[PDB]
Structure formats: C-alpha cells, structure tokens
Amino acid sequence: EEADDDKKRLLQIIDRDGEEEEEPLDESSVKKMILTFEKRSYKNQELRIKFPDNPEKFMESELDLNDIIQEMHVVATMPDLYHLLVELNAVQSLLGLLGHDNTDVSIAVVDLLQELTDIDTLHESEEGAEVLIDALVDGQVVALLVQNLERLDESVKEEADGVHNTLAIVENMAEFRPEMCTEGAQQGLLQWLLKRLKAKMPFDANKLYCSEVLAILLQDNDENRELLGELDGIDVLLQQLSVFKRHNPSTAEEQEMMENLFDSLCSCLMLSSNRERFLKGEGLQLMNLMLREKKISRSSALKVLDHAMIGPEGTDNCHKFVDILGLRTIFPLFMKSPRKIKKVGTTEKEHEEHVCSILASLLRNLRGQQRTRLLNKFTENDSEKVDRLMELHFKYLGAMQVADKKIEGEKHDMVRRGEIIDNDTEEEFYLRRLDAGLFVLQHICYIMAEICNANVPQIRQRVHQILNMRGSSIKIVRHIIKEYAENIGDGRSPEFRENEQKRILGLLENF
C-alpha cells in the first residue's frame, strides 16, 4: 500500500508553473474558452461524485475549475460575444455552479457575474446586453444568488466580498432592467435584505450596501412596498432607525445608511397599506421623539411625519399624532425654523415646507376633539400662530411675485423677439415657481382658508385684519387656492380629483 505517493505527487501539480504568451479575443477564442470551461466543470462534478470523501482525489480538478472561471473575466471586455455564452450554455452552467458544494467556487462565479454585468460594460452592446440579461432572469439568478448567500460566512473576508459582489449584481440588473426589481424581490432578495439589516452584527460596509439596495428595490415599485409590509419590514426599518434617536451615527458611512433607511421608510409610506403598519409599529411615537431630541435625525424625522399623515389615508395617523402630544412638538418648529450650521440637513425652505404640509394634512383630516385641540393652538396667546402664518404668507408671496414678474417679463421679451412660447418653455417657467416656494405658499393659503372656515371669529378677524393693513388682498389668496385645487391629486382616480376639487373650492365661500 502507498496512498502517500499521490499527495506528494499532487503538491508537484498545484505548484506546477504556467506557460506565458494577447490579441483581443475573437469568437473562436471565446468558443475555445467555453469548451474548456465545460470540460473542466464536467470533470470536477464527476470526480466529486466518485470520491465524495476523498478531497485529494478531486482538488486538482477544482483548482482547474477555479482557474478557468477567473480566466473568463476577459469576456466582459467584449460584450458582443455574450450571445456565445448563452448559445453554448455557459450561463446555465455558471448559474448551476452557484450551488457548488465548495464556497470558493460559487464566490468565483459571483465575481465573474458582476464583472460581466457591469453597467458601463452592458451599454457597450445593446444587442449583447439584452441576450445576457434575459438568460440571467429566465434562469432565475436572484433566486440562486440568494440561496448561495444564505451559506456565506461574513467573518471570512473572501466570502464577505461574495456578499458584496452579489449585491453589486442586483444593483446592476435593476439599473439595466428596472422591470426585474419586482421579480428579484419576490425571489427572496427583499426577504434576505431585511434579515441582514436586523442581524445583530456590527456596522460594516455590507450593511451600508444593503440599505442602499433596499431603497432601489422600493423605488417607485408599489408591489415591493406591499411585499416589505407582509414581511414585517416596517418594524425592521423602525428598529434600525431607533438607534439614532438620542445618538448621532459614529462614522460618516453609518450616517448615509441612516438616510438610506429613511428613504426606504418614506418610499413605503407612499402605499396606503403601510400607513396602518407604520401606526401599529409605533412609528409616530418614534418620529416624535426624534423631533424632541434634536439630533442629526431631526430633519428626516420631520419628512417621515409628513409622508405618514399626508392625504386621505393618513387620517388615522393624524388623530394618533395629536393623541401622543404631537402638537407641543410641531408648533415650536412652526414658530422658529432651525438653522443650517451643519452640512447634512434640511434648508430653511425645506423645513417650513414640511411643517406647513403637516398642518395642512391635520386641518384636512382631523375631526372630533383632536381638531379642536389644533384650532385652539391658533387662538392661544392672542392668536400669535395666526401672526406667524401671515408672516410666512407674505414671505413666500413676496418671493412668488418677484418670480412671476420676471417670468411674465420674459414672455413679453419673447414676443418682440418673435420667439414662440413653447410647451417646454412653460414647463421651464413652472420650475422657477416651484423653488420660489409655490408648494409652501399653497399650504400656507390652504391652512389660512381652513381656519377661517372653523367659525372661530377671533381667527377669521385677525386674518382680514393683517391682510389689508399690509396691503395684500384676500383675492390673491383666492387665486392661489383655485390654482391649488386644479392641480390636485395627480396620481389618483378621476373621481378623487373631482371631489377634492369641489371640497377645496367650497372653502372660498364662508371665507
């Protein structure tokens, strides 16, 4: 017996040198390369069946299999030949190797897959890109990549890179095919991203990457937003954000992660079904606590509250917000806007924009005792809040009039010039009005009109009292509101826009 003269002979093999030598691969270089890949992949699979308990007997075939996969990164240089990888079933083979028993192999193909699906690489060949992406999606890449992901140890660097490269793949496909975000998320990816986020590990760069991918998956995709709801993802997001309620993020990469979660949270609140979830998950209480602490997360917390209470489906959140003493929190922000001395936060216009969007949401949705508590805020201290509302009114009416004057002047200049006023000219105009503070001013006017319909004489009197003693007309407000009611509910049923139009306009009588 001597089974010790084949390991000594094996070491002489894995230390064997390599011949040296070119010209950019043609279709025949790739053909030769793929055949070798199938040749080595078949030998390795066969040897692992023959000697499942004797690694020495199949490890030089696995070394060979790993070498060809590394070598195939060159194919990404010329995406015109991607049709060859599909026709010759290299893609079906590679996807099968994602479930190879050795983790070193599966990692290797994940590295190859991300190199092949590089965004700049894919745009080099529209024809070659489509055929590759179609093979990947039909062969269920995201499903297989996730399955392989579940067996990776992140305490091992080579496999931590594998997790990263796996995510890099989906960031690539979702940019080339935004249509596959739904399929990808439902193939277990979203489920996995949630687990990885709430995993009790320290903050590494892979957690930052997960927060980033999750935002992409939820971007204008109502189907994935509902999916995140079913998977109890709102709770995960709230739990992760609750770390930064009293403390700021240590590093800067952790601060960006915090914002990627805030993005995902707002993105989920776009779906009405997630409003009740955010409510049951005590998100309102959390957000309100962040406003009281006044840490870094104070800016995005205000944004979340606005998204939660906005519209008809935010009516339950509006009532709960008042219940949890939200009024004592929001009105100080209404009186004075926090200053931007830092670098990462909302501006003054952006702050006042959300506060006014919040009050307008409350005035639209609140009923019962909660509505009275809101109106009483406007009466207290000799209606100082009404004075504050008017100060804001004149500020944005001023900025708006300056912009409107500049816009109308250009219209006249264009007429003498002979230039026709385009539809892409009128759209350029609308943008100048927006960052002048149009949306803010519209909320300020809606608030003004709603509290004058409250049949509270001290309020209605003060509004008219301030309006003329400054010079502005009650008619200017009526103009802004008609314009506001017109462009309402963009993204909702024709029935909705019709009834809300009626409702808003009805506030102009009895004003």
From Swiss-Prot:
GO cellular component: centrosome; cytosol; membrane; nucleoplasm; nucleus; Prp19 complex; spliceosomal complex
Keyword match Acetylation: yes
Any GO BP annotation: positive regulation of apoptotic process
Record-linked InterPro entries: ARM-like, ARM-type_fold, CTNNBL1, CTNNBL1_N
Residues with Phosphoserine modification: S337, S493
Domain of life: Eukaryota
N6-acetyllysine carried by residues: K39
One Pfam family named in its UniProt record: CTNNBL
Keywords recorded for this protein, A-Z: Acetylation, Adaptive immunity, Coiled coil, Cytoplasm, Disease variant, Immunity, mRNA processing, mRNA splicing, Nucleus, Phosphoprotein, Repeat, Spliceosome
Sequence ranges of the HEAT repeats: 27-77, 82-124
Tissue expression pattern: Widely expressed with highest levels in skeletal muscle, placenta, heart, spleen, testis and thyroid.
Residue span of motif Nuclear export signal (NES): 78-88
UniProt GO MF annotations: enzyme binding
UniProt effect for mutating M414V: In IMD99; when expressed in a B lymphocyte cell line, leads to decreased frequencies of somatic hypermutations, a process involved in the production of isotype-switched high-affinity antibodies, the defect that can be rescued by the wild-type protein; decrease interaction with AICDA, hence impairs AICDA nuclear localization; may decrease protein stability; no effect on interaction with CDC5L
Coiled coil (UniProt feature): 424-488
Alphabetized PANTHER family for the sequence: BETA-CATENIN-LIKE PROTEIN 1, BETA-CATENIN-LIKE PROTEIN 1 NUCLEAR ASSOCIATED PROTEIN
Function: Component of the PRP19-CDC5L complex that forms an integral part of the spliceosome and is required for activating pre-mRNA splicing. Participates in AID/AICDA-mediated somatic hypermutation (SHM) and class-switch recombination (CSR), 2 processes resulting in the production of high-affinity, mutated isotype-switched antibodies.
Disease: Immunodeficiency 99 with hypogammaglobulinemia and autoimmune cytopenias: An autosomal recessive immunologic disorder characterized by recurrent sinopulmonary infections appearing in early childhood, B- and T-cell lymphopenia, and progressive severe hypogammaglobulinemia with decreased memory B cells. Patients may develop autoimmune cytopenias, such as thrombocytopenia, or autoimmune features, such as vitiligo.
Domain remark text: The surface residues of the concave side of the superhelical ARM repeat region contribute to, but are not essential for NLS binding.
Subunit relationships: Component of the PRP19-CDC5L splicing complex composed of a core complex comprising a homotetramer of PRPF19, CDC5L, PLRG1 and BCAS2, and at least three less stably associated proteins CTNNBL1, CWC15 and HSPA8. Interacts directly with CWC15 and CDC5L in the complex. Interacts with AICDA; the interaction is important for the antibody diversification activity of AICDA. Interacts with PRPF31 (via its NLS). Interacts (via its N-terminal NLS) with KPNA1 and KPNA2.
Protein name: Beta-catenin-like protein 1
Gene designation: CTNNBL1
